[PDB]
Design an enzyme around this catalytic site. Sequence first.
Site, PDB file in Angstrom:
ATOM      1  CE  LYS A  92      -7.960  11.028   1.223  1.00  0.00           C
ATOM      2  NZ  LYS A  92      -7.181   9.464   1.618  1.00  0.00           N
ATOM      3  CG  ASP A 134      -2.316   0.625   0.729  1.00  0.00           C
ATOM      4  OD1 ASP A 134      -2.784   0.684  -0.474  1.00  0.00           O
ATOM      5  OD2 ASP A 134      -3.108   0.804   1.891  1.00  0.00           O
ATOM      6  CE  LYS A 144      -6.022   1.152   0.746  1.00  0.00           C
ATOM      7  NZ  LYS A 144      -5.450   1.788  -0.679  1.00  0.00           N
ATOM      8  CE  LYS A 194      -2.969   3.982   3.438  1.00  0.00           C
ATOM      9  NZ  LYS A 194      -2.837   4.149   1.732  1.00  0.00           N
TER      10      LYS A 194
HETATM   11  N1  LIG Z   1      -4.995   6.441  -5.594  1.00  0.00           N
HETATM   12  C1  LIG Z   1      -4.170   6.652  -4.485  1.00  0.00           C
HETATM   13  O1  LIG Z   1      -3.944   7.904  -4.215  1.00  0.00           O
HETATM   14  C2  LIG Z   1      -3.635   5.318  -4.020  1.00  0.00           C
HETATM   15  C3  LIG Z   1      -3.764   4.005  -4.449  1.00  0.00           C
HETATM   16  N2  LIG Z   1      -3.517   3.130  -3.683  1.00  0.00           N
HETATM   17  C4  LIG Z   1      -4.030   1.883  -4.438  1.00  0.00           C
HETATM   18  O2  LIG Z   1      -3.448   1.624  -5.809  1.00  0.00           O
HETATM   19  C5  LIG Z   1      -4.464   0.871  -6.521  1.00  0.00           C
HETATM   20  C6  LIG Z   1      -4.914   1.563  -7.855  1.00  0.00           C
HETATM   21  O3  LIG Z   1      -5.456   2.875  -7.461  1.00  0.00           O
HETATM   22  P1  LIG Z   1      -6.335   3.893  -8.602  1.00  0.00           P
HETATM   23  O4  LIG Z   1      -5.446   3.901  -9.710  1.00  0.00           O
HETATM   24  O5  LIG Z   1      -6.688   4.921  -7.884  1.00  0.00           O
HETATM   25  O6  LIG Z   1      -7.706   2.812  -8.995  1.00  0.00           O
HETATM   26  P2  LIG Z   1      -8.397   2.522 -10.301  1.00  0.00           P
HETATM   27  O7  LIG Z   1      -9.326   1.568  -9.965  1.00  0.00           O
HETATM   28  O8  LIG Z   1      -8.545   3.653 -11.117  1.00  0.00           O
HETATM   29  O9  LIG Z   1      -7.062   1.784 -11.105  1.00  0.00           O
HETATM   30  C7  LIG Z   1      -6.946   0.182 -10.993  1.00  0.00           C
HETATM   31  C8  LIG Z   1      -6.859  -0.398 -12.257  1.00  0.00           C
HETATM   32  O10 LIG Z   1      -6.414  -1.770 -12.248  1.00  0.00           O
HETATM   33  C9  LIG Z   1      -7.067  -2.749 -12.950  1.00  0.00           C
HETATM   34  N3  LIG Z   1      -7.418  -3.986 -12.610  1.00  0.00           N
HETATM   35  C10 LIG Z   1      -7.947  -4.469 -11.503  1.00  0.00           C
HETATM   36  N4  LIG Z   1      -7.561  -5.694 -11.145  1.00  0.00           N
HETATM   37  C11 LIG Z   1      -6.699  -6.007 -12.031  1.00  0.00           C
HETATM   38  C12 LIG Z   1      -5.878  -7.282 -12.137  1.00  0.00           C
HETATM   39  N5  LIG Z   1      -6.074  -8.358 -11.579  1.00  0.00           N
HETATM   40  N6  LIG Z   1      -4.813  -7.193 -13.244  1.00  0.00           N
HETATM   41  C13 LIG Z   1      -4.846  -6.102 -14.196  1.00  0.00           C
HETATM   42  N7  LIG Z   1      -5.394  -4.904 -13.839  1.00  0.00           N
HETATM   43  C14 LIG Z   1      -6.118  -5.017 -12.899  1.00  0.00           C
HETATM   44  C15 LIG Z   1      -8.514  -2.002 -13.113  1.00  0.00           C
HETATM   45  O11 LIG Z   1      -9.194  -2.221 -14.532  1.00  0.00           O
HETATM   46  C16 LIG Z   1      -8.123  -0.431 -13.151  1.00  0.00           C
HETATM   47  O12 LIG Z   1      -8.230   0.105 -14.267  1.00  0.00           O
HETATM   48  C17 LIG Z   1      -5.438   0.656  -5.481  1.00  0.00           C
HETATM   49  O13 LIG Z   1      -5.376  -0.706  -4.983  1.00  0.00           O
HETATM   50  C18 LIG Z   1      -5.592   1.661  -4.526  1.00  0.00           C
HETATM   51  O14 LIG Z   1      -6.173   1.527  -3.266  1.00  0.00           O
HETATM   52  C19 LIG Z   1      -2.885   3.159  -2.438  1.00  0.00           C
HETATM   53  C20 LIG Z   1      -2.897   4.426  -1.826  1.00  0.00           C
HETATM   54  C21 LIG Z   1      -3.160   5.441  -2.722  1.00  0.00           C
HETATM   55  O1  LIG Z   2      -4.558   9.360   2.458  1.00  0.00           O
HETATM   56  P1  LIG Z   2      -3.779   7.983   2.726  1.00  0.00           P
HETATM   57  O2  LIG Z   2      -4.407   7.502   4.078  1.00  0.00           O
HETATM   58  O3  LIG Z   2      -1.995   8.152   2.997  1.00  0.00           O
HETATM   59  C1  LIG Z   2      -3.934   7.014   1.643  1.00  0.00           C
HETATM   60  C2  LIG Z   2      -5.086   6.547   1.487  1.00  0.00           C
HETATM   61  C3  LIG Z   2      -5.438   5.515   0.475  1.00  0.00           C
HETATM   62  O4  LIG Z   2      -5.472   4.487   0.781  1.00  0.00           O
HETATM   63  C4  LIG Z   2      -6.757   6.058   0.076  1.00  0.00           C
HETATM   64  O5  LIG Z   2      -6.631   6.716  -1.275  1.00  0.00           O
HETATM   65  C5  LIG Z   2      -7.438   4.708  -0.766  1.00  0.00           C
HETATM   66  O6  LIG Z   2      -6.949   4.263  -1.825  1.00  0.00           O
HETATM   67  C6  LIG Z   2      -9.055   5.208  -1.048  1.00  0.00           C
HETATM   68  C7  LIG Z   2      -9.906   5.312   0.196  1.00  0.00           C
HETATM   69  O7  LIG Z   2      -9.637   6.021   1.321  1.00  0.00           O
END
Ligand SMILES: NC(=O)C1=CN([C@@H]2O[C@H](COP(=O)(O)OP(=O)(O)OC[C@H]3O[C@@H](n4cnc5c(N)ncnc54)[C@H](O)[C@@H]3O)[C@@H](O)[C@H]2O)C=CC1
Ligand SMILES: O=P(O)(O)/C=C/[C@@H](O)[C@@H](O)[C@H](O)CCO
Lengths: 525, 525, 516
Positions: free
Chosen positions: B404, B312, B361, B481
């Site tokens: 967020k 994470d 999470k 994290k």
């Molecule tokens: N967005 C943020 O600021 C942060 C993100 N993360 C984590 O990073 C990850 C991605 O976040 P986002 O880009 O916002 O989400 P998102 O949902 O927009 O992007 C994830 C992508 O992964 C693809 N996907 C899902 N399962 C898959 C698999 N088995 N193989 C290949 N592709 C697959 C989905 O189709 C999607 O396009 C999540 O687990 C999120 O919790 C953790 C901390 C902060």
């Molecule tokens: O803002 P943080 O607590 O450092 C990170 C938080 C991340 O886990 C989040 O964006 C999570 O993906 C979405 C739900 O809150």
Amino acid sequence: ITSVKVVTDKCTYKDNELLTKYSYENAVVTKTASGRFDVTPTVQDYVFKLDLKKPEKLGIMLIGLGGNNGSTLVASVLANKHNVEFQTKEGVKQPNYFGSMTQCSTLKLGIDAEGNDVYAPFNSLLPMVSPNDFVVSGWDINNADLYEAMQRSQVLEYDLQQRLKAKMSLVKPLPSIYYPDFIAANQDERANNCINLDEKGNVTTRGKWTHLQRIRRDIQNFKEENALDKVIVLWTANTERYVEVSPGVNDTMENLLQSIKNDHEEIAPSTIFAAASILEGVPYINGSPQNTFVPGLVQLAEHEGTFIAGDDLKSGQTKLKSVLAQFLVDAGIKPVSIASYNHLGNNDGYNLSAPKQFRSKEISKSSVIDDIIASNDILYNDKLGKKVDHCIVIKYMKPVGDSKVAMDEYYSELMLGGHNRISIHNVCEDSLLATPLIIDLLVMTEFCTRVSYKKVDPVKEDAGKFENFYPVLTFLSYWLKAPLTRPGFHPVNGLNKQRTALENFLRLLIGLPSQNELRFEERLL
Amino acid sequence: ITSVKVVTDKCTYKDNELLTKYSYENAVVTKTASGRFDVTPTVQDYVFKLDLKKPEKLGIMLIGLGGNNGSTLVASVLANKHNVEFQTKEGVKQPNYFGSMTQCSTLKLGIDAEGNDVYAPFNSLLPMVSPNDFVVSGWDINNADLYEAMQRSQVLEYDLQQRLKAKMSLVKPLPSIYYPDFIAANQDERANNCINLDEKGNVTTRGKWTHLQRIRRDIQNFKEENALDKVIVLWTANTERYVEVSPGVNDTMENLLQSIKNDHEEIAPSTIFAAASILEGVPYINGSPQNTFVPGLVQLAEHEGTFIAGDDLKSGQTKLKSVLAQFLVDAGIKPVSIASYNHLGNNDGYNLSAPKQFRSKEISKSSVIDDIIASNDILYNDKLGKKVDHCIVIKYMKPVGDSKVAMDEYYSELMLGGHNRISIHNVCEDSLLATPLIIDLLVMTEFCTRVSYKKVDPVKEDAGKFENFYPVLTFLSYWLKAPLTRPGFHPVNGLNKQRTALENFLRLLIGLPSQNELRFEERLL
Amino acid sequence: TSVKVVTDKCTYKDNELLTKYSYENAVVTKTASGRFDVTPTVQDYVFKLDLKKPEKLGIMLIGLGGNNGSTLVASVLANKHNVEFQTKEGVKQPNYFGSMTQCSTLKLGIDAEGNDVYAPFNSLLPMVSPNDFVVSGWDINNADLYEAMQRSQVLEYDLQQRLKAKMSLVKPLPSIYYPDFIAANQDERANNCINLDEKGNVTTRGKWTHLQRIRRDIQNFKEENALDKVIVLWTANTERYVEVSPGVNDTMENLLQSIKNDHEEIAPSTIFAAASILEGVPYINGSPQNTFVPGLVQLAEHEGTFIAGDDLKSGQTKLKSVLAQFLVDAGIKPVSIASYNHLGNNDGYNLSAPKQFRSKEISKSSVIDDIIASNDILYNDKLGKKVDHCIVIKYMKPVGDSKVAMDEYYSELMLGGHNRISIHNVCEDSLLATPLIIDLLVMTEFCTRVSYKKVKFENFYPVLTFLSYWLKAPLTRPGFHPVNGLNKQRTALENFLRLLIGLPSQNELRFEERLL
Ligand SMILES: NC(=O)C1=CN([C@@H]2O[C@H](COP(=O)(O)OP(=O)(O)OC[C@H]3O[C@@H](n4cnc5c(N)ncnc54)[C@H](O)[C@@H]3O)[C@@H](O)[C@H]2O)C=CC1
Ligand SMILES: O=P(O)(O)/C=C/[C@@H](O)[C@@H](O)[C@H](O)CCO
Ligand SMILES: NC(=O)C1=CN([C@@H]2O[C@H](COP(=O)(O)OP(=O)(O)OC[C@@H]3O[C@H](n4cnc5c(N)ncnc54)[C@H](O)[C@@H]3O)[C@@H](O)[C@H]2O)C=CC1
Ligand SMILES: NC(=O)C1=CN([C@@H]2O[C@H](COP(=O)(O)OP(=O)(O)OC[C@H]3O[C@@H](n4cnc5c(N)ncnc54)[C@H](O)[C@@H]3O)[C@@H](O)[C@H]2O)C=CC1
Ligand SMILES: O=P(O)(O)/C=C/[C@@H](O)[C@@H](O)[C@H](O)CCO
Ligand SMILES: [Mn+2]
Ligand SMILES: [Mn+2]
């Protein structure tokens, strides 16, 4: 003393009774397919009768008497009645009923010689009962006396609890009805003052009709032991889960009373208390979110002609939300996301930590903005979207005690892509907020019991006989989250509108028209 | 160009390699029954070898390439690499890597002639790869190209997306491994770029070993198609549920590889990607909270000698919490209640709206303060209480998109009954925060692959041969994290302490001692 | 609880501790081409720590009757005598929460598992305990400390009542009141002054006589309680900065002369500092005014007396430096930081006047300039090197001692993004300031028992910059710019205590885990 004397020919007094003439105006609207609104004004004349002989003492029986709200209410009554000043770090403080709309709010009576607004106490227009005249008792599945209750609650100043020690210690809750399945499991150890115990002396949901009979006798006993003429029952006990409403069970006055006798599993303790009070002809107010008033009960109230009312106290986060969301929509602003988080560490939050109890609360804390969205199809419609994301979260955090922390975010749309983001952090002693609202509900319910009226036939003098308010007292909506309504009618949660109804009501009884805010003494030459 | 030249005899250069001598000091402590701490200092000399020949292009394969983070990363690389300025309401903006500790933070090298602190870019001490040199690709269960991905994500300025349209449109995610049970059901419709399809062409969790073989070939193919020498794999796909760790299944390198071949139900897609990268000798970084690194995998990494890391991204609310809670306890203040609420409306929040994903999470977002509580038994002990109420809430609110909203309340105790209440409202484009952290992880992981060392025997010159970092790269904890640790060791989440480790590491490679902050040039005559 | 380090760098000689230490650092120069030339430097030292700490430490607080002064005395008596008290949440035990020396810990090293072992901050080397503080002091108001407590409205009513008997016995000595140096409203409050004329009126004439009277008060306090060590700390209303002029207060000889000449730029704090210095007792300035003028610093050096101070680094400013630093260390660029504050205590009342507040607006601001300057990647002439900042303090009586601080950090993220962090911090201001004062006293006393020599022992240069962790306007040596990174400031103290017992600075490298 504060009193009001209105010079009007619409009011006459006859044997401790005020008789007031009133012409109620409204209008029926229809909307043409085209899009025109045809408005047909209406009118119905009435004669309201107000029994001026208010009771010297009003019996109050709280279900949940040993809880935070229950003990605090008794404490506030004792403290104020006896002017029990107390020490704090800010010094000696004088008892008061701050937080009470009924005891501490004012209303505009008119303008003075200079043309400046004149206000008088909300309770100075017509005779109302003082909470200092409340004779309180009630039930609780826990036998702790009210001093222990205060200590346990941790709501009141240590010094105040100590000064109220002697008196509060002598106040003990009557044993109550405990049916394990209706509240959180964690309240199990707390239940040790139950009337429903089998031969083994264990908790039993068997014999629900005997329980009903005991509660009724409890009311009768309490009344005579205090030489009281009137009593009001108010539920301020743990939030129960919702009960399933089903045909042949609790859909009619008859099915309900039978189910009670058959010990149906969908007959909750509140169902029994409500049925008991109604059968005793005692007003019953529901201060919690569970759906105690299933069709069969409302039907029983209508048949008995007994006041019922309630469904959760609207005290903090929801009260302010019913002001803020209204404000935004009235201004043409479109809320699209409203997130409401909450955490508290009292027994209220401990019980609500369980999903079945939380869901009850969650429903009532959300409903408050539905009517608002519905009132504006310019903003909320199929083309622009008619939905507002809304989430309610309640977490149990013991370290904050009775001081619930409410955090909300109202995210709205402005013109041309803009947005408005209002973040809020609301902290307060939840019981110090709720208690005066419970006081208001009782004061207003009692006032309502002394009101009657009759339609006036324009072409026929002295027609009709006086009636009492329709059983469901919607006039108390100001103090509730999910306003119980008359079958067919939709609730209105706008706080300011709810208070206005109460205001104009009191105003009309003393012969004054509703507030118009036109001030033509100023706007016109 | 920025560069540092340290005059020290601890560093020598030989054929594009820097050799640096370093004496590492620490101390082993024991606590007497009585209560005395016996501290035995220690020392172990080393010779670190840094391959100075950094790659001209670094292959980057993201799993979840079509998501918010994935598309934003490619966009940031393209925008910066090509200096793609873009229009906003605040005017033309120049691309940058703000939010990147690796690209935009500085470090104190020492003091100048006047005695004033001198800082240099974090990436100017020793040769590091520029994200402008990233050649990015990867997989995604959804086939949308990266321009559609940007549109769908709604993270970047409209004008910027438009300028990147041409290039981003040509970037298409490779089909991936979709096992329905590991992520939220609501992602079902999204999955249309899968390699695991039966004869009927339907999704199948059968043939998990063939999938593993495809992923490995994907890595090989990508590498040669780009004439790359190095590639790093980073998981930035939907948060999966935790997988059950059990004996004979995924507890050992052997049981794991077999379970994969047997298609065990506790072998998630991340398990396959991790195993594949490890088997290819490619660094694998887990940017999500699921427990991808079960014992058997870590064991496989140790055996293969391949870098693994993660669990994470620590980007917003948790990053700041690892600063604020540390601060309070370091000051002798006792946090007793920490409530953390969150709501977002992107796909990340849509998937996390399901309990199994949210729990992953929820665990990583809480763990961050455990070590802090444990470090102070003056405040946290059996007599005063050693618990800190902590709740994490994540609600899906579509209207807020990728922005967020994090709301936290830190309620702490002060002396003599006092308390401190810190309320926070943190808003930001979650992807704009996360993206640079993903960039940092890749930059630092690549740097680490060019580092080796060997223990130095004081009484025996040139003993031992160079080794590489222990497989689990804990040096990257700053960006995660739930820091993955070496078996036996407990993680440290103090953000400032995590950065200090990275700082002193770079400092020692160029022959400088760790920061002491003593400034005796000032404090002493 | 004690610490025993097995090292050959430390030798004990009868309540004496000798520790060898090589201080490494580096001097850097920058080429036009942008290349940094770094030359490491080492200076060896030998530190001597008198392990014989006072059994009782005298504390004289100027402003003894205020929020901080009264809470300080109450906390000492409450903890010392284990005065448990009733609250609506139940009976609570007294403690020193909020104090770094009393309630924070430090990592000594790792155990057999490779995990960190922490020990009390005051357990490495002998330090005086606040329970052994003997407190007295001055105040322009003569209310006893029980009345002071009630007036302050800081503590639980029941705790105040349990301390009534003891606190009543404590009364502040009359003080020096020069009206023009503080907020007007602090007038009829001044019923306890030594500076009076032969008519009985408050006067600014005869300043040397006032000085002589403070020295006497200090000598009497010492003798009266049979105390060897005494420390003086100013925690009285903020004064209005004085103007530093040549021949007036630029030197030790002029300063003393101007005092005898009843000069208008000689403030009451100026005299308490001079008196303390002459009596050889350490003086700590817990307020923003520039008490320590040049001439005064020379007197401290000359007499070899320790001074320190310039505003008690309050919670907000404390947490604000932490957050701002944290953001910049992460490569995030704050571009706007707004701070609003309101309190309803006498402090807020006195600061309600521009000349008092102005002093405080100068100290709390400089902290972000260090941060801006530390990163030219973010702050430069091309991208802009400024950070809008504003400090506002309003007097809102009703919130009493519970100061409310509201900040808002607006920062730029990559590609046009932004981060908006808005805070709302509430707390009994004096419950955070009291323990900070305890830390200052404890650490000043410790520093006085420390001497060093490069490679006859010498003392800690007059200005104890080691205490910057607790001061908003870090007083520094001429030429050197103050550092405010709170974490860095605590690092210094941590490493100082470490080097005295033969332990090197924390590196956080954890090679026992990271390396094979
Ligand atoms: N967005 C943020 O600021 C942060 C993100 N993360 C984590 O990073 C990850 C991605 O976040 P986002 O880009 O916002 O989400 P998102 O949902 O927009 O992007 C994830 C992508 O992964 C693809 N996907 C899902 N399962 C898959 C698999 N088995 N193989 C290949 N592709 C697959 C989905 O189709 C999607 O396009 C999540 O687990 C999120 O919790 C953790 C901390 C902060
Ligand atoms: O803002 P943080 O607590 O450092 C990170 C938080 C991340 O886990 C989040 O964006 C999570 O993906 C979405 C739900 O809150
Ligand atoms: N309390 C806090 O949280 C912080 C306090 N400070 C500093 O400490 C000072 C005191 O703070 P509080 O105790 O809250 O205020 P306070 O207003 O309660 O204390 C000052 C009061 O004025 C008196 N006084 C004024 N001039 C005097 C003089 N010449 N000699 C002796 N007594 C004199 C006493 O000090 C009296 O108690 C402030 O003015 C400020 O400079 C700085 C940061 C935080
Ligand atoms: N506290 C507040 O500010 C508001 C309270 N309410 C509701 O009022 C109710 C009471 O709140 P609190 O006083 O804070 O909670 P509480 O938990 O302190 O008090 C409830 C009391 O009811 C008793 N009880 C439970 N089931 C009972 C039964 N079947 N018969 C008799 N006694 C029973 C419990 O033993 C307890 O002493 C809850 O449903 C709460 O959600 C609603 C809005 C605001
Ligand atoms: O503050 P509100 O939303 O008007 C009322 C809220 C009440 O339901 C709460 O106190 C509830 O009893 C506890 C959980 O939050
Ligand atoms: Mn309550
Ligand atoms: Mn994102």
